[PDB]
């Protein structure tokens, strides 16, 4: 069985990284909601 | 040190004092990493001295 999560940091950073949220308006709304909740990891960047 | 004593000094004397303080800082931190300096506290005071000189090196140099 091959599972659904086949990791890759390039596709991870291109799909859910900080600049991929900061490109669009809805990603900036995502970041505003993460800061309003107060989360430690804003995105998955490292 | 006496901050007023550094207020009575000039640009060149304060620059030579800054470079001498940084040299003494380097000697002390290499000695502290080497094993000596039972008296550690001088480290802190030397750091503060350099900061004070840089304050006047902005302040006497002009507003």
């Amino acid at each position: 069985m091959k599972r659904t999560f086949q990791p890759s940091v390039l596709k991870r950073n291109r799909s859910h990284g900080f600049r991929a949220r900061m490109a669009t308006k809805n990603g900036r709304q995502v970041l505003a909601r993460r800061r309003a909740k107060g989360r430690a990891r804003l995105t998955v960047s490292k | 040190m006496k901050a007023k004593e550094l207020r009575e000094k000039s640009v060149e004397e304060l620059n030579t004092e800054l470079l001498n303080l940084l040299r003494e800082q380097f000697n002390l931190r290499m000695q502290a990493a080497s094993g000596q300096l039972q008296q550690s506290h001088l480290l802190k005071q030397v750091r503060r001295d350099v900061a004070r000189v840089k304050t006047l090196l902005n302040e006497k140099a002009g507003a």
Partner: protein, 89 residues
Amino acid sequence: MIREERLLKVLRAPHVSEKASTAMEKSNTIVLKVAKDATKAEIKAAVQKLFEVEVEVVNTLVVKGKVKRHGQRIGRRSDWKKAYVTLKE
């Protein structure tokens, strides 16, 4: 200028180990912990002007911190830079 101030600030500590001692014997190479910025040219300039010794070549590596546990806190140690400074024969 502000050259020699940077030279005073780049060096941090000498390293003491088994590999450092074997280096200084078998290769006349000193091992020392530098700042994180620390280009090799300014490392060579600093050790030449402050330590009165001519320098052949400088290798640099980066030592990553170990993720230690204290009590229950996970804490990473600080990330520092090591330099093998080779002296002239």
